[PDB]
């Protein structure tokens, strides 16, 4: 039926990119809130 | 056999505990610390931080 | 079987690398005092 | 003047050799009665009627055999009350039905649960922070999942731990046996923890003993140090710079250390408790199932663990004939797992 | 197999040697009270 | 009188009458 | 380590003599020599020079001498003999073999083709280097040497 | 799961009992705590009022 | 009136009789007159 | 009103506890993994 | 503090933060309703451990028939 | 406040009051053994009561609510 | 294919080891 | 009035009467 | 101006190296290297041991089906008994891995290695004026790997009986152990037992006494731990306040009014413990048992009344007929 | 054999926390940067 090992493709790269953009947003917001 | 060979396995190993106590506190007390760190000069204070 | 050595060639670095390591420490150990001491070790270096 | 509650607190706050306190009226007389009862269990009543054994030492045991052994398995859950419909207020039958394992336990509950609130109010009467009652939270764990939740969720309490030594160590080989609880991660967690506590009380000792200023002249050290003084008694700072270039990392912050010696056996009691919860309900880590099906499949092919389900095949066929008398297992020559059977 | 065993001693020689010639070097000197 | 008192007699009466037992069943022909 | 047994494994008492003469030469040279001498400039920077470093040092060499001796308790045989000390771990394994090898030797068992519950010898067994050894648990004891079996062993 | 759930939620009302009744010294103590815990000091543990 | 149930009320009145009502009576005897001394 | 909430508080988390709680889930995730693939 | 209708009509149920009664107020009945509430679980407890049985209470899975 | 510990060992009172008590308890206790009550109390059995004539197998409590019943069926005799 | 995960676990265990021990935040004294 | 090690030496003593009793009973 | 042996001499005591090397450390970097290299990759991809000595094959590594907690090296073979057993003794090198080879290296690199750590610590110790004696406390695990991993395979005859490098391995030990040598009955088992029970117990007691004392020195909003600064002169908890409070928990004398006392009580007890257990476990490598009291309760007649310990030795005997299969021809297990 | 979807169990547990850490380490960094 349906090939396994694409659950891990597709969930891996939907949150490893999601977790890095996720980070930057974080990042970018506390030093701005350090900034203040 | 059994009781000469676990008593004496016994008292080499406490021996060897000994030996390790001992060179120990001749090494400290021959150099000098083995009362403890001088609070005047430590050691440790004078060095570079290591990281 | 001394040392484990079955084969002659073995004695060469068995023998030979204590030789150089000696011949360093022997440079130190003549750039050292060497007379003797009254002290639990020596302070000179 | 003052009213009467205000008078008895009065008197169990004050500050005596023995401190009462209000958790002194749960703790002095639970404590004194599970110890009580422990030593007329393993002194006098015997496990002839419950277990076929001896456990006392008007039957001839020592230290190490005699117990307060676990009531019979047709009991079930029940509370063995003296009064109770077991026994019926005869304390003879009370005590050969293994009623005073359950006076043992119940008492020990609540006498865990008091000293637990005298560290809470001591604590509280101090003025300090109430961490040691957190750290016998794990204990308190320990002893309600082993000895109630365990036999709670068995048959009866006849499996529970019975109070003794050797009765202890049939207990560790019966539940890996029965249930391969060396297997268990949560078991695993556990040891982790003890064995982390006792590397850390060790090197914790050793690196305060070794760190120590010179603050007095005598070469035994131990009279250069006074409660009150102010300055540390031992250098951080080495002690830092020596576990940093020893093992790579050390702490540098004494509070983060203390809180560590805390945390690490609390949680390895806590993650085992876990998992005696577990096998409580035989919910176990007894197999791995791919390990199994190759080991089915392939007749050469053989690890450690498979010698452990092995060897626990053995204790259970070995053991169950005499540690279980009540089912009546009689097990021929031929059915008993044998190495050199196959 | 001769090849393998060979260099296993030289190399245990050479630390060994090291270890020796290392603590014969004034080691209790190499201290922080000395001088 | 005090507290501690009980506290001590509480742990004392039955702990010579258990040694006394005990010591007696030291002497039970086996 | 196994089959040579360092000092462990002298097996006659002509070199237990031999070399207790060299013993009592080497010792009488070496005390004469330091009652003699003083100590060499390496030595002196060794070595601490304390009655307490004297105690550690006697401290590992009498800790040495112990599992030494522990080890000559259990496992050697000729200053141990085995009419006094009893026989060793090695020693009891390999009699019980010896003695079922020969009541089946005698009773009617052909011991030298009896096949193991492996395909191995379950009386008498091939050794790792080749000899003919005694077969079952106790292969891993072939290396023992007793006076009651090497008349019997070629 | 639900024995496990009970079982941790003991500990988490313990912590959270212990951090009710503590809210003062959540940081820490002070050097009121010294004259306190001096033996037979007071007459009640605890207690300012009955120095003895 | 089951013979467990006439057991169970007995065992409450043997508790209050024997534990509560000693203890707490002992209690407020001793904490009325080893009183303390709030001057 | 909608805007500054004073109860507003910085979180911060220094590397040795980001390294103790790595240190924790690969630790956590090497004993378990042997268990949830069988 | 934006004030809403819905917020005037429940003010008045939070109002009082710290209000007390003086004294021991209701403590003592409050004692004797936990002390009740103790029996009642001390008996419901021995019915569902068959430490305390009852007429025409069978603690079994067959009385449901 | 609390009682030093040499006005207790200093205390007459305190030696002949122990000496006419405690030994009292001992030979109390050893009598409690050596008679035979204490295995009358507890129920623990003798040596020669382990096995009877007719019961020589463990005696096992099989049922709950009779289980005073079936000791006194068991322990008779 | 499970071994590939072991692996990788293990050889993520040592990685944080290695930059807890090399890369770890450099203890200084503060003046307080 | 009587020194303590005196006393700390006679309760040793039975202490150890008491460990040698256990253990011949033990034995026997 | 200096020699090159000395300058070498100074960087190896040298320190200002991130990681201590000393001359201890000389011996003890590339064994531990080695041991660590040869434990990685023979635990990931070794072929099966025949560990018994008779033809049947274990396996204990990753790619031949095993997992973390199943995976181990296995130990030599029972036909190598503890002959040493290098690569350059074996035929082949695949006679090597089959043979349990690994298992002597890694054993014998690592236990040198252990030695040169505690070397290492004496030394660094030494070199900072420091007292020396961290290493008498590391001496007691590594007297319990000696004892598992070296003395009992020297009392037994074999390294095949040493404990294996792995996890359900390490079980296998204890329950064989258990099963031929009755441990749990053996006093010094017990006494390590206690010692890491009291080494938890004391370890959990000291962190809370301590925690539960610390002198207020932040704000609510930030963590305790702040309020110690690395390197402080003054103490960063009150120790006369943990003090009373557990001389008021127990007795006002089951308290340690020295902190020099109680560190050293705390760095003694679970030390002697562990000594005290890795002997007993040396010990019974010389099959010196524990306590047997298996048949010690008789009826008037005679006949055996069970104890708890005929329980445990029911158990015994269901681990010790289970044991190494097919490797015993002959009753008794001599 | 060895069961599937135990593969997306190991490695969503082992990443997600994880993710939370690091996420949580470089917010407190970057607001310690901007707090200079
Ligand atoms: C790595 C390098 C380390 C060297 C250690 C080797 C291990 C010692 C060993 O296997 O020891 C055993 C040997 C004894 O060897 C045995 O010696 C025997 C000698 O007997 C022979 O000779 C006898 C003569 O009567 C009998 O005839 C006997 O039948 C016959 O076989 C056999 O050769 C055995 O095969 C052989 O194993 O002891 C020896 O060589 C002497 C004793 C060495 C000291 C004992 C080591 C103690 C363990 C370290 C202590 C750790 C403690 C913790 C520290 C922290
Ligand atoms: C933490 C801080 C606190 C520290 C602890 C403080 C000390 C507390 C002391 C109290 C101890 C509780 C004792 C409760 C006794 C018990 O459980 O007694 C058990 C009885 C149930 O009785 C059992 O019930 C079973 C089910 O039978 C039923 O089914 C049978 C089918 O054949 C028959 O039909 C039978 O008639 C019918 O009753 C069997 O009959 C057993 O033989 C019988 O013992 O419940 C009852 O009394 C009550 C059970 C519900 C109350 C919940 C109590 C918590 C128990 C949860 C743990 C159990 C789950 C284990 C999970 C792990
Ligand atoms: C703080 C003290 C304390 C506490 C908490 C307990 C607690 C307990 N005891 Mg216990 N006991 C105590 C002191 C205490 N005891 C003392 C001092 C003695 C010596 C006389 C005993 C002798 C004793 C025996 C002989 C037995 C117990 C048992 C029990 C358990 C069952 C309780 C039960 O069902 O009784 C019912 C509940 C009560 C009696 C509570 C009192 C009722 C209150 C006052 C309300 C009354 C109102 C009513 C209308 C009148 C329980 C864990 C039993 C046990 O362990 O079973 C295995 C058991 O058989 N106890
Ligand atoms: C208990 C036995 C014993 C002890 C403790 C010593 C101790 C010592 N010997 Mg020595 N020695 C001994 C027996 C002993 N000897 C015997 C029996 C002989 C005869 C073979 C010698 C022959 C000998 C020589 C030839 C030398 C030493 C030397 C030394 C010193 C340094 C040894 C070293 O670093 O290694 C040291 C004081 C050295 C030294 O300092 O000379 C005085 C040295 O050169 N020894
Ligand atoms: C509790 C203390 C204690 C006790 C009771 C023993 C008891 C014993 N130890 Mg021992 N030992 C101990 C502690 C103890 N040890 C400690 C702490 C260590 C250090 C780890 C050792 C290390 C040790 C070793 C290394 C050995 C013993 C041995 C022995 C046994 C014989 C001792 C012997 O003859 O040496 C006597 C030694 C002397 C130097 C005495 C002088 C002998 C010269 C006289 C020569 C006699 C000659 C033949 C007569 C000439 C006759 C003439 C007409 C020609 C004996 C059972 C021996 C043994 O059997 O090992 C298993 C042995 O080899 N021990
Ligand atoms: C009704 C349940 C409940 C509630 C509302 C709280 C609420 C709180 N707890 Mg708490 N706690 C509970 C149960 C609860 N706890 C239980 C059962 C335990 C025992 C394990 C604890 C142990 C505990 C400790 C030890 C501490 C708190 C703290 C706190 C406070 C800080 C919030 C926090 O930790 O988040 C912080 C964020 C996290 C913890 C996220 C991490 C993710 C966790 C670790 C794993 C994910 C869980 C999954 C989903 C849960 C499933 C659910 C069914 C349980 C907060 C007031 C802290 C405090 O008081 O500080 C002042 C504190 O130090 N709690
Ligand atoms: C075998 C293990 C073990 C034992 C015997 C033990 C014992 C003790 N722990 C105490 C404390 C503590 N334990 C702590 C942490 C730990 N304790 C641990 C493990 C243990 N702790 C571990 C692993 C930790 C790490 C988390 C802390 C933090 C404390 C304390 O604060 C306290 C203390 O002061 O330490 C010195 C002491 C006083 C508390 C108490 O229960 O007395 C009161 C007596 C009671 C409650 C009666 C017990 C009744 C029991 C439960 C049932 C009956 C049992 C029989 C009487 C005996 C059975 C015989 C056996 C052989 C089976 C007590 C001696
Ligand atoms: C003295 C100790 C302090 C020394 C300071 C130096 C520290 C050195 C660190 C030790 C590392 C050396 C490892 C070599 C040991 C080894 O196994 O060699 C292995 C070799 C044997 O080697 C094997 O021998 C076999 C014999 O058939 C075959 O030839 C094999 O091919 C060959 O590998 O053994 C020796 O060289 C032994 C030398 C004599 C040592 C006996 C004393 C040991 C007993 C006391 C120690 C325990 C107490
Ligand atoms: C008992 C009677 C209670 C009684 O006499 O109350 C009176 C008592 C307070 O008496 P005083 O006269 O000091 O207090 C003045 C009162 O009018 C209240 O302020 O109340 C308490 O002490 C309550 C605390 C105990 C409450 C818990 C026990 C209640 C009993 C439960 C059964
Ligand atoms: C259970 C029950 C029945 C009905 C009444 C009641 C409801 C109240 C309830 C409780 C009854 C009670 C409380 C009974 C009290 C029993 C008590 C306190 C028994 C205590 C016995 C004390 C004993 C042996 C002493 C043992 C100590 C020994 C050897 C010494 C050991 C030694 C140590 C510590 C170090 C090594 C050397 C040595 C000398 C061996
Ligand atoms: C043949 C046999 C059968 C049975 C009976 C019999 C006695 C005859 C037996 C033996 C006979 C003989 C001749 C035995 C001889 C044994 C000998 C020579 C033992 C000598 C061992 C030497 C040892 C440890 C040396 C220890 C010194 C060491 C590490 C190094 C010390 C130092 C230096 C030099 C280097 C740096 C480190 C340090 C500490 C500063």
Chains 1, 16 share one sequence.
Request: charged share 15%; with cysteine; aromatic share 16%.
């Amino acid at each position: 039926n349906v090939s396994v090992a694409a659950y891990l493709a597709v969930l891996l790269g939907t949150f490893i990119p999601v977790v890095f953009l996720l980070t930057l947003y974080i990042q970018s917001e506390s030093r701005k809130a350090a900034e203040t | 056999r059994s009781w000469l060979t676990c008593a004496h396995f016994f008292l080499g190993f406490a021996f060897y505990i000994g030996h390790l106590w001992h060179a120990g506190r001749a090494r400290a007390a021959a150099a000098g610390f083995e009362k403890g760190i001088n609070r005047e000069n430590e050691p440790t204070l004078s060095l570079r931080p290591i990281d | 079987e001394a040392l484990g050595i079955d084969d002659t060639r073995l004695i060469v670095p068995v023998i030979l690398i204590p030789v150089i390591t000696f011949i360093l420490y022997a440079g130190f150990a003549s750039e050292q005092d060497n007379e003797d001491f009254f002290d639990t070790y020596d302070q000179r270096r | 003047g003052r009213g009467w509650f205000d008078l008895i607190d009065d008197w169990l706050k004050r500050d005596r050799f023995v401190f009462v306190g209000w958790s002194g009226l749960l703790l002095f007389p639970t404590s004194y009665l599970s110890i009580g009862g422990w030593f007329t269990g393993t002194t006098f009543v015997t496990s002839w009627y419950t277990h076929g054994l001896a456990s006392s030492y008007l039957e001839g045991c020592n230290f190490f055999t005699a117990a307060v052994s676990t009531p019979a398995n047709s009991m079930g859950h029940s509370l063995l009350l003296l009064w109770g419909p077991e026994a019926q207020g005869d304390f003879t039958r009370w005590c050969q039905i293994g009623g005073l394992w359950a006076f043992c336990a119940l008492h020990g509950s609540f006498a865990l649960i008091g000293f637990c609130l005298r560290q809470f109010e001591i604590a509280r009467l101090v003025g300090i922070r109430p961490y040691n009652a957190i750290a016998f939270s794990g204990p308190i764990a320990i002893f309600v999942s082993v000895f109630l939740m365990y036999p709670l969720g068995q048959a009866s309490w006849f499996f529970a731990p019975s109070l003794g030594v050797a009765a202890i160590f049939r207990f560790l080989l019966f539940i890996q046996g029965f249930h391969n609880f060396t297997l268990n991660p949560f078991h695993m967690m556990g040891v982790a923890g003890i064995l982390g506590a006792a590397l850390l009380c060790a090197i914790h000792g050793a690196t305060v003993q070794n760190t120590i200023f010179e603050d007095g002249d005598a070469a035994n050290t131990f009279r250069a140090f006074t409660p009150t003084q102010a300055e540390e008694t031992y250098s951080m700072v080495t002690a830092n710079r020596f576990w940093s270039q020893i093992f790579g990392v050390a702490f540098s912050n004494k509070r983060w250390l203390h809180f560590f010696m805390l945390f690490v056996p609390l949680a390895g009691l806590w993650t085992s408790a876990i998992g005696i919860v577990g096998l409580a309900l035989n919910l176990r880590a007894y197999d791995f199932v791919s390990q199994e099906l190759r080991a089915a499949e392939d007749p050469e092919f053989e690890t450690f663990y498979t010698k452990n389900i092995l060897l626990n095949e053995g204790i259970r066929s070995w053991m169950a004939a005499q540690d279980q008398p009540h089912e009546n297992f009689i097990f021929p020559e031929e059915v008993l797992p044998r190495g050199n059977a196959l | 197999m001769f090849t393998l065993k060979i260099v296993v001693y030289t190399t245990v020689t050479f630390f060994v040697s090291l270890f020796t010639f290392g603590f014969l070097s004034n080691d209790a000197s190499r201290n922080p009270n000395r001088k | 009188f005090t507290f501690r008192w009980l506290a001590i007699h509480g742990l004392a009466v039955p702990t010579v009458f258990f040694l006394g037992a005990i010591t007696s069943m030291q002497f039970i022909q086996r | 380590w196994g089959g040579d047994g360092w000092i462990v494994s002298v097996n006659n008492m002509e070199d237990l003599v031999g070399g207790h003469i060299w013993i009592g030469i080497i010792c009488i040279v070496g005390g004469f020599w330091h009652i003699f001498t003083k100590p060499f400039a390496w030595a002196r920077r060794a070595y601490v020079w304390s009655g307490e470093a004297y105690l550690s040092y006697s401290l590992v060499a009498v800790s040495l001498m112990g599992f030494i001796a522990s080890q000559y308790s259990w496992y050697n045989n000729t200053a141990y003999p085995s009419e006094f000390y009893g026989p060793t771990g090695p020693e009891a394994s390999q009699s019980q073999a010896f003695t079922f090898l020969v009541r089946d030797q005698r009773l009617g068992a052909n011991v030298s083709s009896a096949q193991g519950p492996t395909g191995l010898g379950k009386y008498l067994m091939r050794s790792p280097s080749g000899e003919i050894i005694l077969g079952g648990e106790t292969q891993r004891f072939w290396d023992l040497r007793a006076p009651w079996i090497e008349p019997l062993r070629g | 799961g639900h024995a496990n759930f009970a079982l941790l939620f003991f500990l988490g009302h313990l912590w959270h009992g212990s951090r009710t009744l503590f809210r003062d010294v959540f940081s820490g103590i002070g050097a009121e705590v010294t004259e306190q815990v001096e033996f037979g000091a007071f007459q009640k543990l605890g207690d300012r009022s009955t120095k003895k | 009136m089951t013979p467990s149930l006439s057991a169970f009320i007995n065992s409450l009145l043997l508790g209050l009789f024997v534990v509560v009502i000693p203890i707490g009576a002992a209690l407020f005897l001793v904490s009325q007159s080893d009183r303390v001394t709030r001057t | 009103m909608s805007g500054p909430n004073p109860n507003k508080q910085p979180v911060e988390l220094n590397r040795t506890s980001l390294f103790w709680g790595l240190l924790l889930i690969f630790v956590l995730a090497v004993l378990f993994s042997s268990y949830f693939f069988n | 503090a934006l004030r809403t209708r819905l917020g005037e009509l429940l003010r008045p149920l939070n109002s009082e933060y710290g209000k007390v009664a003086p004294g021991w107020g209701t403590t003592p009945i409050m004692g004797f309703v936990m002390l009740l509430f103790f029996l009642f679980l001390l008996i419901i407890l021995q019915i569902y451990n068959s430490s305390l049985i009852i007429e025409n209470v069978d603690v079994d899975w067959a009385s449901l028939g | 406040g609390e009682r030093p510990f040499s006005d207790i060992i200093t205390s007459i009172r305190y030696w002949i009051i122990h000496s006419i008590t405690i030994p009292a308890l001992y030979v109390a206790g050893w009598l409690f053994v050596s008679t035979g009550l204490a295995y009358d109390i507890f129920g623990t059995p003798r040596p020669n009561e382990y096995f009877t004539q007719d019961r020589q197998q463990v005696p096992l409590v099989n049922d709950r609510f009779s289980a005073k019943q079936e000791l006194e069926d068991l322990t008779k005799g | 294919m499970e071994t590939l995960v072991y692996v990788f676990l293990l050889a993520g265990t040592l990685g944080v080891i290695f930059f807890a021990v090399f890369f770890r935040d450099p203890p200084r004294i503060a003046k307080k | 009035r009587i020194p303590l090690w005196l006393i700390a030496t006679v309760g040793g003593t039975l202490a150890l009467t008491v460990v040698g009793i256990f253990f011949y009973g033990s034995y026997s | 101006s200096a020699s090159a042996w000395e300058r070498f001499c100074s960087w190896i005591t040298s320190t200002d190296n991130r990681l201590y090397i000393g001359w201890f450390g000389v011996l003890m970097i590339p064994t531990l290297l080695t041991a660590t290299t040869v434990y990685i990759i023979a635990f990931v991809a070794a072929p099966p041991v025949d560990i018994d000595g008779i033809r049947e094959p274990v396996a204990g590594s990753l790619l031949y089906g095993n997992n973390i907690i199943t995976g181990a090296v296995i130990p030599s073979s029972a036909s190598i008994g503890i002959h040493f057993y290098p690569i350059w003794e074996a035929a082949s090198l695949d006679e090597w891995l089959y043979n349990g080879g690994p298992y002597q290296l890694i054993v014998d690199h690592f236990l040198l290695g252990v030695c040169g750590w505690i070397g290492r610590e004496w030394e660094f110790s030494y070199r900072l004026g420091m007292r020396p004696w961290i290493s008498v406390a590391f001496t007691a695990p590594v007297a319990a790997a000696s004892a598992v991993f070296l003395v009992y395979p020297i009392g037994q005859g074999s390294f095949s009986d040493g404990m294996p490098l792995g996890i359900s391995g390490t079980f296998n030990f204890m329950l064989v152990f258990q099963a031929e040598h009755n441990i749990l009955m053996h006093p010094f088992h017990q006494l390590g037992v206690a010692g890491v029970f009291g080494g938890s117990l004391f370890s959990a007691m000291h962190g809370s006494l301590v925690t539960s004392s610390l002198i207020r020195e932040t704000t609510e909003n930030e963590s305790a731990n702040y309020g110690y600064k690395f390197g402080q002169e003054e103490e960063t908890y009150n120790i006369v306040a943990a003090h009373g409070y557990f001389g008021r928990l127990i007795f006002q004398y089951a308290s340690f009014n020295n902190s020099r006392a109680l560190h050293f009580f705390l760095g003694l007890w679970p030390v002697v413990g562990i000594w005290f257990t890795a002997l007993g476990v040396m010990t019974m490598a010389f099959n010196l048992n524990g306590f047997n009291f298996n048949q010690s309760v008789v009826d008037s007649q005679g006949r055996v009344i069970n104890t708890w310990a005929d329980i445990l030795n029911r158990a015994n005997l269901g681990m010790e007929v289970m044991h190494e299969r097919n490797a015993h021809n002959f009753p008794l297990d001599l």
